[PDB]
């Protein structure tokens, strides 16, 4: 339907002109307007004190990468080549080989941390539930030669915590 805003004439009589000529000349606006609305400084400021206090997050957060493994270790990956076919940005670079025991595994596994556009399409394409976007934004290295990840970074980075990650996925696998 409709609504009309700023469609109204002034009253234009003897009374209300003095109501408007008290505004322009002796400033009944602009002090009652914003000498009071601003101060109003007497609220408590809301500043996260960052090196000690940190802010809220959520158990589906996206961040640093990881590769989990089973109870007593098996390197949960099986090199099934899906986490590399739905990266939209073509970050993953897998090259498998039949490992000597007979079960197949990776040899090289490479995730750029610069082409990584942070979908969550690796996290959800995996059948065997291995590669997980882990919940730690701790980053900021100083060389481009470093942010390229190998296989044997991710496991170290994926076994620095699993008490962190496995508390998250157990809360959230019930929806997906």
């Amino acid at each position: 339907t409709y609504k009309y805003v700023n469609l109204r004439e002034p009253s234009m009589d003897m009374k209300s002109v003095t109501d408007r000529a008290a505004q322009t000349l002796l400033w009944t606006e602009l002090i009652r307007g914003l000498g009071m609305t601003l101060s109003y400084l007497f609220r408590e400021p809301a500043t996260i004190n960052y090196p000690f206090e940190k802010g809220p997050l959520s158990p589906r957060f996206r961040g640093e990468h990881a590769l989990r493994r089973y109870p007593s270790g098996e390197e949960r990956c099986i090199a099934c080549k899906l986490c590399e076919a739905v990266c939209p940005a073509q970050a993953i670079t897998i090259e498998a080989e039949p490992r000597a025991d007979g079960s197949r595994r990776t040899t090289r596994y490479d995730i750029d941390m610069t082409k990584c556009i942070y979908c969550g399409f690796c996290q959800e394409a995996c059948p065997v539930d291995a590669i997980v976007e882990g919940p730690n934004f701790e980053f900021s290295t100083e060389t481009h030669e470093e942010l390229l990840y190998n296989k044997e970074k991710l496991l170290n980075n994926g076994d620095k915590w699993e008490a962190e990650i496995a508390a998250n996925i157990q809360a959230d696998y019930l929806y997906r």
Binding site: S72, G73, E74, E75, R99, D101, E152, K153, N156
Partner: peptide, 10 residues
């Protein structure tokens, strides 16, 4: 910096 434990045969 390289891996320490192996699951090549664990």
């Amino acid at each position: 910096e390289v891996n320490e434990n192996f699951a090549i045969d664990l």
